[PDB]
Amino acid sequence: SKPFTLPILTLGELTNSRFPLPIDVLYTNPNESAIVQCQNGRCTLDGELQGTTQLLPTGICAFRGKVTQQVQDEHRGTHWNMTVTNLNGTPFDPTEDVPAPLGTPDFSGQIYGVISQRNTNTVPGEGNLPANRAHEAVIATYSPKFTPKLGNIQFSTWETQDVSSGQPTKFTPVGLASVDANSHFDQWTLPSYSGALTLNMNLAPSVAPVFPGECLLFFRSFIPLKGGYGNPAIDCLMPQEWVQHLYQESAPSLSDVALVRYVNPETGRTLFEAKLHRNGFLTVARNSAGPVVAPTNGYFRFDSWVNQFYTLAPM
Amino acid sequence: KPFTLPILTLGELTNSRFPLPIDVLYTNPNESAIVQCQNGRCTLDGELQGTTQLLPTGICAFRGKVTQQVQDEHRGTHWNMTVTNLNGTPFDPTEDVPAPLGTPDFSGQIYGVISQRNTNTNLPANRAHEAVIATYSPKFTPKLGNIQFSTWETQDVSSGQPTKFTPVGLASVDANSHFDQWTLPSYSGALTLNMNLAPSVAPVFPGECLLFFRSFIPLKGGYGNPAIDCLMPQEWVQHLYQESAPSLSDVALVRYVNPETGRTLFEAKLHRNGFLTVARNSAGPVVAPTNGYFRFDSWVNQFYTLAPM
Numbered sequence: 251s252k253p254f255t256l257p258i259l260t261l262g263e264l265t266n267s268r269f270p271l272p273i274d275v276l277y278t279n280p281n282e283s284a285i286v287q288c289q290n291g292r293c294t295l296d297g298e299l300q301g302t303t304q305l306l307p308t309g310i311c312a313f314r315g316k317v318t319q320q321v322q323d324e325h326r327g328t329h330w331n332m333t334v335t336n337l338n339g340t341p342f343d344p345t346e347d348v349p350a351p352l353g354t355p356d357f358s359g360q361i362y363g364v365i366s367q368r369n370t371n372t373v374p375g376e377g378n379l380p381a382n383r384a385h386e387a388v389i390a391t392y393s394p395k396f397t398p399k400l401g402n403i404q405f406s407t408w409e410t411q412d413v414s415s416g417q418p419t420k421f422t423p424v425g426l427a428s429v430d431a432n433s434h435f436d437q438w439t440l441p442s443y444s445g446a447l448t449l450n451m452n453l454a455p456s457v458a459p460v461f462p463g464e465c466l467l468f469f470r471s472f473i474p475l476k477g478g479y480g481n482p483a484i485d486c487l488m489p490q491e492w493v494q495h496l497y498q499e500s501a502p503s504l505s506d507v508a509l510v511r512y513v514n515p516e517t518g519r520t521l522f523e524a525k526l527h528r529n530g531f532l533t534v535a536r537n538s539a540g541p542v543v544a545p546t547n548g549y550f551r552f553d554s555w556v557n558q559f560y561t562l563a564p565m
Numbered sequence: 566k567p568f569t570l571p572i573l574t575l576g577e578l579t580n581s582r583f584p585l586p587i588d589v590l591y592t593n594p595n596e597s598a599i600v601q602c603q604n605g606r607c608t609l610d611g612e613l614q615g616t617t618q619l620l621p622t623g624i625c626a627f628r629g630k631v632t633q634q635v636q637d638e639h640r641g642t643h644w645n646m647t648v649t650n651l652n653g654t655p656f657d658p659t660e661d662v663p664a665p666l667g668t669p670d671f672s673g674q675i676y677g678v679i680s681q682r683n684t685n686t687n688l689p690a691n692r693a694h695e696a697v698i699a700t701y702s703p704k705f706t707p708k709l710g711n712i713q714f715s716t717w718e719t720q721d722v723s724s725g726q727p728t729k730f731t732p733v734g735l736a737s738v739d740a741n742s743h744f745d746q747w748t749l750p751s752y753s754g755a756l757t758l759n760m761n762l763a764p765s766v767a768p769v770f771p772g773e774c775l776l777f778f779r780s781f782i783p784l785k786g787g788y789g790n791p792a793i794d795c796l797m798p799q800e801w802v803q804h805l806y807q808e809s810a811p812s813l814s815d816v817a818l819v820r821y822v823n824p825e826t827g828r829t830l831f832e833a834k835l836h837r838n839g840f841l842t843v844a845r846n847s848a849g850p851v852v853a854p855t856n857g858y859f860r861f862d863s864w865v866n867q868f869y870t871l872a873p874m
């Protein structure tokens with residue numbers, strides 16, 4: 251049985267699996283009322299990707315496809331419909347057992363980024379090269395027009411004209427447009443992948459502590475804002491590098507819970523211990539919300555597989 | 566400890582020189598430029614070199630603070646920005662690196678988004694705008710702790726506030742935009758010599774050429790299909806760093822394999838300093854099945870003759 255392992259990466263060497271951001275801090279929120287059921291950064295300890303999770307850091311909250319036409323929408327700005335393919339360019343097959351194309355955003359909000367295009371057709375007078383354009387864009391994942399599971403979504407631009415129809419289109423995520431009341435940011439509310447009133451399917455399961463005194467431990471990143479007030483954050487269950495490592499290794503899970511220790515490599519001392527659960531998430535024995543204030547060199551080290559009776563030392 | 570590569574297809578790899586997926590393997594034997602990129606540089610035994618760091622989010626990224634609006638012959642509105650290390654600590658120019666880790670390693674107009682989250686609050690004000698960084702500019706001096714960027718936005722950039730640059734692509738590949746993926750920036754400005762560089766790479770055996778992992782990079786406007794070629798994908802850099810397997814010779818013989826058929830499509834030399842050569846006498850993409858990946862075979866020496874592609 252191939253021994254289970256985690257990568258040896260400090261917090262400053264990790265990135266978020268739910269948005270293209272570095273990990274900033276470890277974080278807890280024991281009194282969170284929402285169901286925690288994110289779809290990116292989901293991977294079992296034996297290497298099975300789940301939900302909309304894929305391996306590319308560049309694929310997280312990215313879209314690839316083609317603009318079909320400019321469309322009408324009551325909201326401010328100029329709106330565009332785009333078909334979306336799989337990130338590798340092959341057509342998305344809605345009959346596949348996934349909630350949506352892999353990489354699709356897994357939260358409600360106004361995702362800010364850049365739409366870019368490189369035309370298929372080339373111009374002889376320009377050295378047989380294609381024309382290009384890029385503009386800021388916003389994707390409202392709560393919108394009834396956000397239907398990635400159906401193979402198309404809508405984005406808005408400040409730019410009123412310079413977006414071409416029928417041309418290869420890329421969305422590069424940068425942050426959020428706003429976290430105002432009317433922008434509906436909620437990192438734990440899933441989009442309706444097939445549109446309003448439809449049930450999401452093939453979801454990675456919800457996660458939660460089962461043991462008294464325990465709470466979820468998150469890898470937190472702060473996400474940029476186009477404007478307005480706020481310090482929004484995105485919490486993932488495991489960094490993208492862990493997803494990548496677990497997938498590579500595919501080590502058999504020898505129980506439902508792996509005991510891991512957060513270690514200071516300088517002192518060698520254990521800062522705290524955590525349970526790493528089979529489905530791919532952490533719990534700690536902590537009675538407070540907020541950042542885990544720990545030396546920058548710290549990293550999780552796999553200790554052993556434990557049983558249903560193991561009690562964590564309080565943080 | 567045995568040397569290994571990750572098991573990742575081209576469609577599971579990302580570029581180490583710009584935040585892009587790998588699109589194709591690529592050769593260009595007649596390239597006249599010296600190849601000495603500084604991102605995606607890692608020895609086979611796990612030593613990061615040049616400006617290479619581990620984060621996919623750190624490649625061609627900057628962190629720092631805007632000092633003031635400035636003037637420049639380039640089009641747009643210009644801003645000077647001090648830069649720190651990506652982890653926020655002050656950049657110490659006396660450290661043995663060419664520039665802050667993550668700094669772009671090529672000449673061009675790098676297009677992206679500058680965003681700011683104010684220090685003062687009880688929530689801070691924010692703003693983001695499109696931005697261009699001309700890495701060939703005399704004002705591009707990251708090794709001295711500051712750079713200049715331009716915006717279309719004429720006013721809404723705050724001085725003395727934490728500032729992030731998220732790269733997206735290139736602004737242009739016109740003649741006046743000086744895109745050359747193999748021309749290093751002058752990290753300390755005009756007239757100063759770059760220091761602490763990752764070494765240049767080249768085949769040392771006849772009949773061989775460099776093999777690149779190629780990504781196509783977005784353009785803000787204009788005509789072109791620009792690409793960025795890296796020596797090893799970011800996942801390999803991350804893997805080699807993790808593993809730190811001793812290099813048992815100067816050349817690791819690797820085979821590009823079809824996992825379905827089990828067949829070897831071609832073989833390559835993976836050199837100790839972290840780059841590939843193949844025996845190929847043509848330029849362009851390597852047309853290979855999507856399931857293919859490199860597998861370590863054995864250590865050989867520099868005189869080993871590769872099977873022609």
Ligand SMILES: C[C@@H]1O[C@@H](O[C@@H]2[C@@H](O[C@H]3O[C@H](CO)[C@H](O)[C@H](O)[C@H]3O)[C@@H](O)[C@@H](CO)O[C@@H]2O)[C@@H](O)[C@H](O)[C@@H]1O
Pocket residue numbers: 476477478479690691692693721
């Ligand atoms: C808090 C405030 O957020 C951002 O301002 C936006 C407004 O943005 C518009 O105005 C600003 C200049 O005031 C700038 O020209 C920007 O490009 C433009 O879109 C606007 O969205 C309003 C809508 O109610 O909210 C905010 O005031 C930012 O630009 C400001 O610097 C500041 O951080």
Ligand SMILES: C[C@@H]1O[C@@H](O[C@@H]2[C@@H](O[C@H]3O[C@H](CO)[C@H](O)[C@H](O)[C@H]3O)[C@@H](O)[C@@H](CO)O[C@@H]2O)[C@@H](O)[C@H](O)[C@@H]1O
Pocket residue numbers: 381382383384412785786787788
């Ligand atoms: C090839 C061409 O590239 C891009 O156009 C730019 C020009 O951009 C300006 O005009 C376009 C619409 O023509 C758009 O309004 C854009 O926002 C604006 O900056 C301009 O920079 C010229 C220089 O004279 O270079 C390019 O032609 C692109 O926007 C076009 O769609 C088209 O692909």
